[PDB]
């Protein structure tokens, strides 16, 4: 209905491939070198996506940059889970066309637990009957769901921008009331999974010269600089419920 919904649609990225050799077998190293590359490509995309968000150019440049690096994994997880719901009805993990996980890739990549978790999420799209427009507006907010305890450079704008994003989600909803608790519940559950993945990538990064996994330019930096912040409690997610 509104202008808002046109934008989220319009700006929504397209198909992004990982370029995986689906012919050779499933080594850890092969698998995770392609996820890192998948991370790298989708990040670019989250950047060009986010810059085009409504209200986004109201934040201090450093705030923009920050808010993005902190929330990228959280977003990645969400659309991944939509993708896996929408293509394969949550039967497997749809990272990309050329990189769909099956239980075997799940266990060989060594992320079985986190993978189990994200498959649960994908299911929830279906269980809770998530409309495409509910998906987009939920996604938009996740970028505004994670800040330093310390606080952003222009914190007022953020608070404001966010408030209007929560408003638009409520608008696209409005015993209906319980839909919100559900949708906020659902967003809230994204944060644990992004933390687990933060940890594993973090671990992985450190051991990586000594297991032969490829960490792209942008990968190695974000993980070693901004990820630790989150894992040390310096940077928290905003939760709806307690």
């Amino acid at each position: 209905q509104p202008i808002f919904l046109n934008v989220l649609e319009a700006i929504e990225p397209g198909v992004v491939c990982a370029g995986h050799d689906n012919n050779q077998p499933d080594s850890f190293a092969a698998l995770l070198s392609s996820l890192n590359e998948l991370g790298e490509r989708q990040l670019v995309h989250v950047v060009k996506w986010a810059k085009a968000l409504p209200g986004f150019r109201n934040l201090h440049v450093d705030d923009q940059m920050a808010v993005i690096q902190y929330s990228w994994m959280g977003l990645m997880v969400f659309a991944m889970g939509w993708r896996s719901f929408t293509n394969v009805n949550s039967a497997m993990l749809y990272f990309a066309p050329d990189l769909v996980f099956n239980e075997y890739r799940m266990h060989k990549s060594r992320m079985y637990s986190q993978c189990v978790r994200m498959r649960h999420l994908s299911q929830e799209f279906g269980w809770l009957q998530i409309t495409p427009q509910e998906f987009l507006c939920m996604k938009a907010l996740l970028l505004f769901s994670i800040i330093p305890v310390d606080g952003l450079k222009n914190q007022k704008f953020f608070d404001e921008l966010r408030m209007n994003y929560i408003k638009e989600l409520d608008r696209i909803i409005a015993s209906c009331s319980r839909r919100f608790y559900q949708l906020t519940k659902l967003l809230d559950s994204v944060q644990p999974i992004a933390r687990e993945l933060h940890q594993f990538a973090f671990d992985l990064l450190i051991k990586s010269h000594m297991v032969s996994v490829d960490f792209p330019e942008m990968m190695a930096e974000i993980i070693s600089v901004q990820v630790p912040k989150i894992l040390s409690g310096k940077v928290k997610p905003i939760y709806f419920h307690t």
């Binding site: 950047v47 440049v61 923009q64 940059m65 690096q69 330019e217 942008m218 930096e221 974000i222 600089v225």
Partner: peptide, 7 residues
């Protein structure tokens, strides 16, 4: 950063 640079 090399992030600050391409942004």
């Amino acid at each position: 950063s090399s992030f600050r640079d391409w942004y």
